[PDB]
Design a protein around this nucleic acid. Structure first.
Length: 293
DNA sequence: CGCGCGTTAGGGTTAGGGTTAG
DNA sequence: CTAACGCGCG
């Protein structure tokens, strides 16, 4: 019946509506724009080495493409191609649909989407396979995904972790206690709050004495951090590590501060990962096999 | 009337990547 | 993709 046509990225013409395949070179996770809709920016590339920046809006958070890391594969349906500031641009059209897939080779091809129904043929399977192979042979694995035991000060990195606590601070910032099974090379800093709003298992937090790190998010991230469920697994993008000379108790001690600065550049944000994700499986293996006395 | 299935029509701003800090 | 839309049935 329905046979969707997929336009190569080097053949895109402005003023049309197309369906596309691509690999994610960069993406901003969905964030509240100054309008009424969540916004998501996604730069994709295909075999033609031509890049396309897509600008997607939706009132439903899950309707936007479910992207978890660079190298993921995406398929877009009903994307409008236009020209903004003498540059080609992709934007949301009426009835926009999205499928996403893991980029790792050999992994099962499992569509991630919010659409109730979607079209998927064997040719889609083969195209996802081909894009996976092309991304393996033409892109690089992300060096920004580090475990806590590998981080260095003054550094931006992406963290796959589990959340253990939340707390209010000053309104402009919000506290998140997280862990990933590994101990940082330097003990984490400890943000102080007069009246603690520690939503979480206090005994379980303290038992993990130094595997827990404090993360202070700011501005637009605050709202998102307020809506997170304790125990869920998170990916925090472009977290910033700094070194510190004296702690919150005004003692002399070198500590690692983790900040999630305001704005959305370099993908700074948070995304909740489902337990069906394989990185979450490895994270579970690390959380269970953690050194603690 | 109530279903129901086939057809296809469609409100247009949000932000349009690129790390000051706190 | 999804649900408003309209003609054709029970």
């Amino acid at each position: 019946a329905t046979n969707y046509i997929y336009t190569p990225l080097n053949q895109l013409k402005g003023g049309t509506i197309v369906n596309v395949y691509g690999v994610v070179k960069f993406f901003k996770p969905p964030y509240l724009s100054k309008g009424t809709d969540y916004c998501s920016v996604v730069t994709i590339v295909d075999q033609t080495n031509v890049k396309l920046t897509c600008l997607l809006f939706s009132g439903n958070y899950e309707a936007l493409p479910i992207i978890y890391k660079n190298g993921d594969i995406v398929r877009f349906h009903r994307l409008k191609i236009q020209v903004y500031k003498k540059e080609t641009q992709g934007i949301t059209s009426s009835g926009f649909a999205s499928l996403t897939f893991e980029g790792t080779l050999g992994a099962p091809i499992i569509p991630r989407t919010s659409s109730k129904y979607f079209n998927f043929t064997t040719e889609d399977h083969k195209m996802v396979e081909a894009l996976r192979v092309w991304a393996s042979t033409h892109m690089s694995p992300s060096w920004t995904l580090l475990k806590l035991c590998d981080v260095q000060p003054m550094q931006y990195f992406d963290l796959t972790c589990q959340l253990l606590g939340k707390a209010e601070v000053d309104g402009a910032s919000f506290l998140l206690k997280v862990w990933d099974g590994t101990r940082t090379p330097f003990p984490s800093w400890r943000v102080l709050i007069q009246d603690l709003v520690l939503e979480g298992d206090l005994s379980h937090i303290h038992r993990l004495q130094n595997l827990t790190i404090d993360i202070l998010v700011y501005d637009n991230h605050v709202h998102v951090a307020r809506s997170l469920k304790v125990g869920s697994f998170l990916r925090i993008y472009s977290l910033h590590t700094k070194l510190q000379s004296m702690n919150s108790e005004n003692q002399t001690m070198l500590s690692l501060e983790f900040h999630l600065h305001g704005g959305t550049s370099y993908g700074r944000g948070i995304r909740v990962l489902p337990e069906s994700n394989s990185d979450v499986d490895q994270l579970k293996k690390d959380l269970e096999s953690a050194n603690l006395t």
